[PDB]
Write a protein that binds this DNA or RNA. Structure first.
Ligand SMILES: [Mg+2]
Ligand SMILES: [Mg+2]
Ligand SMILES: [Mg+2]
Ligand SMILES: [Mg+2]
Ligand SMILES: [Mg+2]
Ligand SMILES: [Mg+2]
Ligand SMILES: [Mg+2]
Ligand SMILES: [Mg+2]
Ligand SMILES: [Mg+2]
Ligand SMILES: [Mg+2]
Ligand SMILES: [Mg+2]
Ligand SMILES: [Mg+2]
Ligand SMILES: [Mg+2]
Ligand SMILES: [Mg+2]
Ligand SMILES: [Mg+2]
Ligand SMILES: [Mg+2]
Ligand SMILES: [Mg+2]
Ligand SMILES: [Mg+2]
Ligand SMILES: [Mg+2]
Ligand SMILES: [Mg+2]
Ligand SMILES: [Mg+2]
Ligand SMILES: [Mg+2]
Ligand SMILES: [Mg+2]
Ligand SMILES: [Mg+2]
Ligand SMILES: [Mg+2]
Ligand SMILES: [Mg+2]
Ligand SMILES: [Mg+2]
Ligand SMILES: [Mg+2]
Ligand SMILES: [Mg+2]
Ligand SMILES: [Mg+2]
Ligand SMILES: [Mg+2]
Ligand SMILES: [Mg+2]
Ligand SMILES: [Mg+2]
Ligand SMILES: [Mg+2]
Ligand SMILES: [Mg+2]
Ligand SMILES: [Mg+2]
Ligand SMILES: [Mg+2]
Ligand SMILES: [Mg+2]
Ligand SMILES: [Mg+2]
Ligand SMILES: [Mg+2]
Ligand SMILES: [Mg+2]
Ligand SMILES: [Mg+2]
Ligand SMILES: [Mg+2]
Ligand SMILES: [Mg+2]
Ligand SMILES: [Mg+2]
Ligand SMILES: [Mg+2]
Ligand SMILES: [Mg+2]
Ligand SMILES: [Mg+2]
Ligand SMILES: [Mg+2]
Ligand SMILES: [Mg+2]
Ligand SMILES: [Mg+2]
Ligand SMILES: [Mg+2]
Ligand SMILES: [Mg+2]
Ligand SMILES: [Mg+2]
Ligand SMILES: [Mg+2]
Ligand SMILES: [Mg+2]
Ligand SMILES: [Mg+2]
Ligand SMILES: [Mg+2]
Ligand SMILES: [Mg+2]
Ligand SMILES: [Mg+2]
Ligand SMILES: [Mg+2]
Ligand SMILES: [Mg+2]
Ligand SMILES: [Mg+2]
Ligand SMILES: [Mg+2]
Ligand SMILES: [Mg+2]
Ligand SMILES: [Mg+2]
Ligand SMILES: [Mg+2]
Ligand SMILES: [Mg+2]
Ligand SMILES: [Mg+2]
Ligand SMILES: [Mg+2]
Ligand SMILES: [Mg+2]
Ligand SMILES: [Mg+2]
Ligand SMILES: [Mg+2]
Ligand SMILES: [Mg+2]
Length: 245
RNA sequence: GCGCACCACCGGCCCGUCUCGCCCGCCCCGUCGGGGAGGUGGAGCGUGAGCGCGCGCGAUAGGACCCGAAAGAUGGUGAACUAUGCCUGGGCAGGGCGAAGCCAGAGGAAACUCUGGUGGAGGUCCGUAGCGGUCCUGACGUGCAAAUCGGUCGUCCGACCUGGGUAUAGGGGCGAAAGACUAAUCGAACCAUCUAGUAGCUGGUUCCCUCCGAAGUUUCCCUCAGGAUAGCUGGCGCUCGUCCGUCGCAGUUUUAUCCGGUAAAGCGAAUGAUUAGAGGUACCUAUUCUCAAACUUUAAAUGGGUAAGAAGCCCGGCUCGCUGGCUUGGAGCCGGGCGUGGAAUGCGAGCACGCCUAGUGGGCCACUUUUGGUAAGCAGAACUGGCGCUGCGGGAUGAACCGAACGCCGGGUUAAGGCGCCCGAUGCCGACGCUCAUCAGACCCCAGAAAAGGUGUUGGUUG
RNA sequence: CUGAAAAUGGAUGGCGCUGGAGCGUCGGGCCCAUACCCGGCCGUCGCCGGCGCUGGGCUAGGCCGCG
RNA sequence: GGGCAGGGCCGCCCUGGAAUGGGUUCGCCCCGAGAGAGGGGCCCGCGCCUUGGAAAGCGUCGCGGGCGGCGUCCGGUGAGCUCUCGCUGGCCCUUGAAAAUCCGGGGGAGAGGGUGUAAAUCUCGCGCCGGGCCGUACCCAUAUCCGCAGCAGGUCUCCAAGGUGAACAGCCUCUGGCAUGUUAGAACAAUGUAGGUAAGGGAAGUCGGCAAGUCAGAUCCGUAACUUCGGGAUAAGGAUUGGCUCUAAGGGCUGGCAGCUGACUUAGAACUGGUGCGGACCAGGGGAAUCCGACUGUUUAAUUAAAACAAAGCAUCGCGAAGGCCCGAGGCGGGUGUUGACGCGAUGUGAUUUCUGCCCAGUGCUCUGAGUCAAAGUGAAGAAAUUCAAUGAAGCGCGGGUAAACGGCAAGGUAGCCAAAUGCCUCGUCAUCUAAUUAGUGACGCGCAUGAAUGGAUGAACGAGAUUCCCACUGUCCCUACCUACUAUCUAGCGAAACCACAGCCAAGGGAACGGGCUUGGCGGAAUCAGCGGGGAAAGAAGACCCUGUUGAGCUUGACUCUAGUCUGCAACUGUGAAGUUUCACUUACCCGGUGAGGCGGGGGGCUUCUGGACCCAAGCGCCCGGCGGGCGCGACCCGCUCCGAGGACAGUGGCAGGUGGGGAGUUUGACUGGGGCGGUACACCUGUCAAACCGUAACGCAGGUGUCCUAAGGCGAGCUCAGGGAGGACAGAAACCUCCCGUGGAGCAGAAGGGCAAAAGCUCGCUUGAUCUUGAUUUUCAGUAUGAAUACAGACCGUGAAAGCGGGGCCUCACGAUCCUUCUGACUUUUUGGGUUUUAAGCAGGAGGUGUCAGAAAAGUUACCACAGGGAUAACUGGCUUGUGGCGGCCAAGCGUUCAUAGCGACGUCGCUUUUUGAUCCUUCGAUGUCGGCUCUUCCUAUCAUUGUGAAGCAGAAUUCACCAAGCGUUGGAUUGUUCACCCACUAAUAGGGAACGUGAGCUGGGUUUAGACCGUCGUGAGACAGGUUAGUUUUACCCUACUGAUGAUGUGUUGUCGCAAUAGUAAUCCUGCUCAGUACGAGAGGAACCGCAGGUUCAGACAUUUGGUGUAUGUGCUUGGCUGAGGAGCCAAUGGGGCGAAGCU
């Protein structure tokens, strides 16, 4: 049989991301001497909408600590910030919404976003609209902080991972029911070519493991193993359990 | 009498192997090497016949008599059609209902309600362009057109329509998913090559004449549309014979002697089935009715085997390690003597009916016999003939029936079948009867009749 | 003769036949098959075939004879 | 270019200060963060004027590339139409490009001259010079492009007049364009294609209201059930509509009410007419329900627009980046990812509302720590190869969880729902719907085989979806007719194609079982025209259906054998150190992240949180060099080995090993067979029979057996005699044991059967291992090969008996297996390759391990998405043989008929016929005979329902029954169903039965069936299947030959014409009612005829148009809409403008 739809996405021909009108990569500043030994004053110049993501992006401007240059960054806009606000980045910056602080220099239970997964990755965790990470506890011996991710998992990261205090703006976006199919079309028309999802039971056996039969049954158990080959790994991949929770 | 070649048979020898064994040899005396006797395995020996060349045929492997697949593989070319994403442009009358927001006037004790207007929302409605393509299953249907035309119809601010520029390439692409679409090609494109792919399967296979002439059956086969094998065929011969005579031969009789368990018969005989009384005391005896394919005491017809001499008979001896009371057997061998060849008839035989060998291995039909089946122009056997391979006369006609089989002709005579005319032959003064039919009847196979009836007519029988 | 009814118009073969061209029993005569008899020609096959002993003859791989 | 209108600054300026808040728009909006007002400023000014500039251009009048005259003017309006510039708002889980290029500002390093200039000057204003290369024609589409073409197809745009009207609708005209689309003339037949009308009835047509028609615009009214409150809705149902003549209402400007001036509409009224008025054009039929899908959207280009897909919603699953998912031959590869759980990826269900039950056994997924377990490694034995042992990963196994996982209902179908798109029986039962209903709806539910995200139930709105009814409408129909246009037709010119063995009149017979040719008959007359669709089993295509092939392909799995990927283990890359094979540490390989690798580590010295500003290119000091300039240091600490961090000898890499692996690859999926499959094994064997007296002899013939059993049930000897019966004998009996007698085997002999068998072959007993070691020959199946199983010897060694003898398995006939490979035994001058020794390996010989498809491949499906080679060797459709079955008819006479066998019947039996049932068969056809029904239409049969003429009765009349001559004539209209077949409603003289390739598809219709789409049920793990249901699904060609229908003509008697004859062929009328006979005959009554006669009708036939109706393009005459001809008048155009009436003709 021919390859399944799930296999053609890794080729990257028509399933690539629509990144034409995107305003840039949202990431923190480069970790320098100003943020490891003090703070640097920024200024929010504009809060823009990035096509593809439901969270706004802030165009924060900084001064280059070594050249007469205006460094403009693109952060994930925390909810509550506005244009004209002075945000600060570093370990000696105060605990305010929008400031970029290490996760080790903050009290427990601090709500932060855009958390660096590794020290200096310029922010990876909790960057979607309406999400945040909570600093659970610290460990001054190993210099490791334990953070609670939006998925409920508690990850032990380094205490030097910077993060933006607050919650990512654009929260409550999923609380609105998309009423039309056209609204869902425009939602993914900027993301990628994946919205109209034909059921595997509606296809033919050549195109999908679940296709075929005089009826549209699945036939085989929908719970597939983890080590299934590409082309058979459909349905519920490595499902620990099934049924209504 | 010497006997060629050849053949039957019996010795003999070589190698393997087996059984039983008592001798022998030596410088390299040993777990040494040799030989005997009797069976047996071998593509042996037994005073070579091969080799080279050419011709022909046969079975093969090669494109392999020619043409033909659905496929498979390697490499490559296509997104000018179309499917989808992206980029950059273009385009989308006139009307209907009329959402939030707003204004005003009212009602009310208050909360709050009501009315008018305004506003112009929406995968809204009618609908043009556009894009689609419902129904007529209309037109056309060797068309205008390898998908079009007309009316009608869907939608027409949206998941809308479209050009251009780009992206994805064949077991891949893409797919709001029809196995759709990917250049009139898609349940795996196109191009060239591998490739003259293979085919137990269809089709075809080119001059004349002479002579001979089949098989659809046996066994085996992942066989049953096919092969292998045996049979049937042809060719090539060869060994002899070829007046009587003698060898030899036979789809035949005769004589002699065996074999069988079918028809018929039997069950008052066995086994099995079965009817009715009778006698003696439900049985028991003697009877009685009806039967067998997997019953039988009996038992044919047809049919099968053998024999009908010289490879014999007769007389006299020899060999043996087998046999043994004893030449006692048995078999072999030797010498001599004896054709009236030791049934009829016909006939040339032999070489494992030699050597090579094509075709065939779908059969079919009839008398009789016979199985399944209500039956069948049904299915399945035995035997013989026939058709197929075969024309001819006759049955009007027709692969099989009847007669008879075939070079080219003349005369004659017939077969089966015919002789009113078609149509050769009764254009006999044929014989004897039978029969009237308002559906008469008119002859193998054979191509429509039954049970039951008639005071039609003609015979006969018993009263 | 009754019993005896199928669909295009039709099949002793047809015409037709009733002192028979019907049925049964027979007689004489007659008709013709590539069958049988005799004869011619052609070929094949078989002759323990014939001829080297010449008007003709014997290209013997020829000629001739017989069935 | 300049100037000025005009427009915009709710985005600017100054004054000032607001509530009695004001300003203001179509809408909004605006203001103490400052309104209103006044006065300014800026941007855009494509407008006007003007330089250009009228000299040119144009119109017109002249005159001779030109000369001239004159004119080119003054105005006024707008929801007008396009274009453009602004203002302002709405919508997005949609935020709707980059770069070249150009400009402004911040900063002030520097530059410039020392008293008139210098630096400098943004086209400031002018002057001077240069601007290369390529493309440029024309078509741009009913003839310049593509589709083989001058092809009714296709192919991206730009500009857009008047009238009507809401309109870029339709219709008419102007500018512009064209010649009717690759020909013309004549005629006006059939049949067509397109358009239209039709009286009376109104779906009776048909599978089905298919097609057609009705409705339609606007205005004023009136608008239910239901609902998600949005809708339904143009619901439905009504009225009005012309022309003309008026009235009233809705503005602006100027002057302070007056004057002037509109241009677009509404409302009311009068008059008027052949009641006609959205007059043409344009332009929804409606309602009551069921089924499915929520909707909009999308889909098989070229047969399926759907109930399919999608969809929002719902739910589940994976994953925190060293990741999930996926690509990839390969890398520090690539996609999602410019991403980060409100994310991405994988599925299921399918809006809302309402619920979503039970089962974790099976399969699958997932989660745990106590038998199996590879390579490597360790240990042991051995000369070594080798062998053995221990250890022993993942995975499996064990255990838990999981069903909005597959599924089922280990659990036994809960809530619901239903004879449903799902119910076999079935046309279920009941009610309703109709005169009549296999349909529809509402109910009933042990439901063949409903059922809950394999989703159950409901449901407004919506639908080119399926279905039922009603209203309205209509030529769908009763029942056809007429008119118009283009064809056909004829002529001029032009001019193909399919097809074709030869060809073309039939009946019957036979035949390859449906001839055109042969046979026997009928008979047959040139050359042709227009038609026609009976025939040529017509053409079109080496049947796609069925089967075969040791031919494939698509797809699927619990098929065979592999594989990418993935998991896991070992050593290598792989270093350092500590502690008890593990853990904590080290960095240095390796790995990841960040950055323009910008401040690291160790010492010394001593700094930014109020604001949408600004921030660099050292001030200062110290030192030094030049003739007013320049340089250096400090300012800004020193030193240093990895840029800084996160990992780290683990990830990872390469190489082996195990697991997993339809993701993928290759292949396979026996044969026989009254088609095939299913079943069976008739596939290797045995007995009886078939089998026809040797042997042999077939079928999916008949009745059975076999894949064993036996240390004796083998071998030998000896003794003994069985089954059963009679008579007896304590318990003891119909059967216990003892005795006698009879007992041809009637018992037994392992088994199926047959044969054989009595001091045997049976039974019992005691000695045994001839069931041993060998060679060859022979028999049977046979090819006379093998195997299997047998026969008779011989040579050994034994058993047994006193011995003769008997015995190398079973009393005989069945009870079994090649090569290769493995294993065992035995033997020897056997090999182990230059010799020797010992291991090992090989060989010889004999057994065993097994191929049951049994002379011996290694083997699951599915295909309707299918393909090829073929096959009438072989199925489904006709015909042919057969007639079991079906239908029909005799014979015999038990009996029925109150009595009486035969008026009418006919049991038990029995004989036939028919080919309108079905079956059987497989002869014809698979290089194709279109296949069900209906419609249409003709002819035929009689086994007569009715009519005609009769006979019979359990015939009084009437009605009816039976039978005869008899097929001339007729056998109907409807509901339901695709249906033939049934059933019912009526009508009728009767509503008889059949054939003709189950007549009739180049006649039709596609309803059924019968491709591909899709749903449901059952079934299968699955792909799929289902003669179960349901929905949508291309019906091609005649001009050829005959046949038939008509039309010319041909025929020979001289030509020609009129008037006739006539063979032969066709043939046609039919049934009924009323009245009278007649309330008569007959009968007790009730009832109730018949002949003649009479008046009409039904069906059919041939005509015909006086009349009535219909058509009507005499385009005849009126009316009228839109437009046009300046108006009237007269007319035209709108593919027949529409409508009224209408001659002739046809009907
Ligand atoms: Mg599908
Ligand atoms: Mg499936
Ligand atoms: Mg299932
Ligand atoms: Mg292959
Ligand atoms: Mg509507
Ligand atoms: Mg349209
Ligand atoms: Mg169309
Ligand atoms: Mg059509
Ligand atoms: Mg046509
Ligand atoms: Mg519509
Ligand atoms: Mg494009
Ligand atoms: Mg390739
Ligand atoms: Mg399909
Ligand atoms: Mg001959
Ligand atoms: Mg034969
Ligand atoms: Mg053949
Ligand atoms: Mg042969
Ligand atoms: Mg052969
Ligand atoms: Mg054959
Ligand atoms: Mg037969
Ligand atoms: Mg047969
Ligand atoms: Mg033959
Ligand atoms: Mg012969
Ligand atoms: Mg005959
Ligand atoms: Mg003669
Ligand atoms: Mg004759
Ligand atoms: Mg009688
Ligand atoms: Mg008769
Ligand atoms: Mg002669
Ligand atoms: Mg400056
Ligand atoms: Mg210049
Ligand atoms: Mg041009
Ligand atoms: Mg043209
Ligand atoms: Mg024209
Ligand atoms: Mg009418
Ligand atoms: Mg009807
Ligand atoms: Mg219609
Ligand atoms: Mg309604
Ligand atoms: Mg319902
Ligand atoms: Mg829909
Ligand atoms: Mg289509
Ligand atoms: Mg699910
Ligand atoms: Mg489980
Ligand atoms: Mg229930
Ligand atoms: Mg109805
Ligand atoms: Mg119902
Ligand atoms: Mg459930
Ligand atoms: Mg629709
Ligand atoms: Mg013919
Ligand atoms: Mg045909
Ligand atoms: Mg074929
Ligand atoms: Mg085969
Ligand atoms: Mg395929
Ligand atoms: Mg496969
Ligand atoms: Mg295959
Ligand atoms: Mg088979
Ligand atoms: Mg016999
Ligand atoms: Mg012996
Ligand atoms: Mg056949
Ligand atoms: Mg019968
Ligand atoms: Mg009877
Ligand atoms: Mg009759
Ligand atoms: Mg009808
Ligand atoms: Mg038919
Ligand atoms: Mg026909
Ligand atoms: Mg047709
Ligand atoms: Mg038909
Ligand atoms: Mg249909
Ligand atoms: Mg279908
Ligand atoms: Mg009376
Ligand atoms: Mg007018
Ligand atoms: Mg027009
Ligand atoms: Mg018109
Ligand atoms: Mg009229």
């Amino acid at each position: 049989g021919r390859v399944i739809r799930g296999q053609r996405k890794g080729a990257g021909s028509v399933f690539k991301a629509h990144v034409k009108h995107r305003k840039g990569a949202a990431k923190l500043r480069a970790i320098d001497f100003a943020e490891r030994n003090g703070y640097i004053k920024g200024i929010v110049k504009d809060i823009i909408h990035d096509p593809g993501r439901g969270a706004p992006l802030a165009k924060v401007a900084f001064r280059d600590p070594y050249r007469f240059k205006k460094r403009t960054e693109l952060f994930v806009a925390a909810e509550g910030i506005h244009t004209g606000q002075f945000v600060y980045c570093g370990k000696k910056a105060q605990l305010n919404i929008g400031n970029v602080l290490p996760v080790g220099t903050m009290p427990e239970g601090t709500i932060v976003c855009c958390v660096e997964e590794k020290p200096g990755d310029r922010g990876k965790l909790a960057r979607a609209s309406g999400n945040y990470a909570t600093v659970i506890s610290h460990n001054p011996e190993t210099k490791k902080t334990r953070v609670k991710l939006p998925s409920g998992s508690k990850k032990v990261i380094s205490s030097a991972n910077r993060a933006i205090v607050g919650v990512v703006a654009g929260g409550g976006r999923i609380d609105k029911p998309i009423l039309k199919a056209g609204r869902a079309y425009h939602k993914y028309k900027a993301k990628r070519n994946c919205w109209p999802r034909v059921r595997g039971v509606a296809m033919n056996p050549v195109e999908h493991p679940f296709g075929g039969g005089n009826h549209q049954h699945i036939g085989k158990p929908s719970t597939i193993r983890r080590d299934a080959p590409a082309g058979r790994k459909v349905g519920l991949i490595a499902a620990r359990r099934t049924g209504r929770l």
